[PDB]
């Protein structure tokens, strides 16, 4: 968990970081879907719990730089990421 | 009178293939469609500004 760990839950295959979830499935509910109609919450077949599946490749990146004719120093801007999560 | 709309950007490979490495490996040989779309959207954004 908390890593890019491929998962095959009851024949449903995916890739992502598994995290503990606060959503409350109904007793018969198995899979969770988002606005995107893509799997976002899953229920562990062995232990009755709910797991969120965030992506492995999350965090926009861009490179501010003056012309290489001038200097080679660059700065990095991570889009939409709080400064304590890098 | 409207002036500018919302500036949007796309990550071509992430949207197309998600987190499947083999999907990206298969994708890289369709050419430079992703580069074209990134360039077009960046042009739209700078035009809005």
């Amino acid at each position: 968990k908390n890593k890019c760990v491929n998962f095959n839950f009851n024949g449903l295959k995916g890739t992502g970081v598994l995290t503990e979830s606060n959503k409350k499935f109904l007793p018969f509910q198995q899979f969770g879907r988002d606005i995107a109609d893509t799997t976002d919450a899953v229920r562990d077949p062995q232990t009755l719990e709910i797991l969120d599946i965030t992506p492995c490749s999350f965090g926009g990146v861009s490179v501010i730089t003056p012309g290489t004719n001038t200097s080679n120093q660059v700065a990095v801007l991570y889009q939409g990421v709080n400064c304590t999560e890098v | 009178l409207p002036v500018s709309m919302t500036k949007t950007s796309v990550d071509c490979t992430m949207y197309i293939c998600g987190d499947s490495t083999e999907c990206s490996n298969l994708l890289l040989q369709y050419g430079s469609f992703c580069t074209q779309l990134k360039r077009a959207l960046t042009g739209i954004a700078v035009e809005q500004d």
Binding site: Q79 | K7, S9, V10, Y15, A45, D49
Partner: peptide
């Protein structure tokens, strides 16, 4: 007050304060 994944929304260069 009268006006209300792979895809990102970039903020505008000029904030509403500078436009005001």
């Amino acid at each position: 007050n009268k006006v209300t994944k792979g895809l990102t929304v970039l903020p505008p260069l000029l904030t509403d304060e500078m436009i005001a």
